Design a protein around this ligand. Structure first.
Ligand SMILES: Cc1cc2nc3c(=O)[nH]c(=O)nc-3n(C[C@H](O)[C@H](O)[C@H](O)COP(=O)(O)O)c2cc1C
Ligand SMILES: Cc1cc2nc3c(=O)[nH]c(=O)nc-3n(C[C@H](O)[C@H](O)[C@H](O)COP(=O)(O)O)c2cc1C
Ligand SMILES: O=C(O)[C@@H]1CC=CC2=Nc3ccccc3N[C@H]21
Lengths: 207, 202
């Protein structure tokens, strides 16, 4: 049995019109996702790779769309952080079950300045600050209750804490994108962009 | 996170992560998670640059998980030269992730024949005419060619490039939302004799 469950109309005029500027398509799709109530449309399955080219994956949230790509925050000492600092190339996929749409985002992640990290940190609900402050993301957790107790002590403040060392913001500066829609008669609609010396090259891909 | 999401394994540390995987997937099916087997699968090219896309896990095997694709696709070409891959399952309803890391191996043609025959026959026409991920020069021509094949009573022959991969796991992580933002992370790594297990900081 085919696994697709999407039933919401998902207009894809861009597959016909081939807009020159793919970030407009990204904005169009994300705005529509917000308006129709897609659940967690910005949950990005982000892939990085280690020193030997072995991929790793996890979900991160896209916090902003920038001129050059998409932005997310994480811990520098995490697996993804360590991998990106050595090999900036990454790829992430958005998949929206309700509309049977995928967006694939490929590019190089760049760590943004601390001033930007400071701002992103302050924009998080302060209830998130204690655990993010005590946790060394992705290192082994030796004592669960100890971590719980330490966070609870910091939570007493009931206000913002200093940005932890290692809390950082990456901009994934895009070099290619794909927009995927279910299409008609299983001719899935794949619109592929690749950065060129000036602007972008645009192609349709076979499903 | 709107549905119940028990994670007793975070407390008990079961020795066999494949048991945990089977149990999580069965639970997902029972509670009615939407498309639980939609795997965001990452591969990488010869420069170490990742690429991603969704594929569906067709079966859970002794060594890992299985999916089908076209050998000439981007993921197929990448796996042919670099077998290492990683995939993530994310279930919004229970705020759970499963991360699967290992090496993908192409299975024999008899296995591919069986997988092909198990697909709904209505999928056979487009899968036969399409060279997945190659540039599409003429949309209507592809549509018309598939329409010609759709008139047949299936099944059609398996197209040469239609293949099955087994992702043989070397590590797994089970992630749950936990309490007080202490997200619960259970990480397994293959050893010479079995599996090592640990908890990770959120
Ligand atoms: C819905 C969801 C969103 C998440 N968003 C982020 C995020 O924006 N940044 C982050 O560092 N981790 C986020 N996480 C946790 C990551 O998936 C992951 O566990 C953590 O970043 C460690 O990844 P790593 O060990 O591969 O580096 C999120 C998890 C879920 C379930
Ligand atoms: C929900 C969903 C499930 C999919 N499952 C598969 C699959 O099992 N096998 C496959 O080859 N493509 C599958 N696709 C299409 C892929 O996402 C992708 O477009 C195609 O495999 C080409 O990927 P590539 O160019 O990166 O190799 C699926 C797409 C969606 C939206
Ligand atoms: O659940 C399905 O059939 C998938 C849905 C969308 C696209 C697919 N492409 C495939 C290509 C080759 C083999 C299996 C696929 N699965 C479907």
């Amino acid at each position: 049995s085919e696994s697709l469950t999407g039933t919401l109309d998902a207009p894809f005029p861009e597959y016909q019109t081939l807009p020159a500027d793919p970030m407009s398509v990204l904005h169009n799709w994300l705005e529509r996702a917000r308006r129709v109530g897609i659940r967690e449309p910005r949950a990005l399955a982000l892939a990085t790779a280690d020193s030997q080219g072995r991929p790793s994956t996890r979900i991160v949230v896209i916090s902003e769309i920038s001129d050059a790509g998409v932005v997310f925050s994480t811990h520098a000492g995490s697996q993804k952080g360590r991998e990106l600092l050595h090999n900036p190339w990454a790829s992430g996929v958005l998949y929206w079950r309700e509309t049977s749409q995928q967006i694939i985002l490929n590019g190089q992640a760049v760590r943004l300045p601390n001033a930007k990290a400071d701002d992103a940190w302050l924009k998080r609900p302060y209830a998130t600050h204690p655990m993010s402050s005590v946790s060394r993301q992705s290192e082994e957790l030796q004592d669960v209750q100890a971590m719980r107790n330490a966070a609870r002590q910091l939570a007493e403040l009931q206000g913002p804490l200093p940005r932890p060392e290692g809390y950082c913001v990456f901009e994934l500066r895009l070099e290619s994108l794909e927009f995927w829609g279910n299409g008609q008669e299983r001719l899935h609609e794949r619109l592929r962009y690749d950065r060129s010396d000036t602007g972008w090259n645009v192609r349709r891909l076979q499903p």
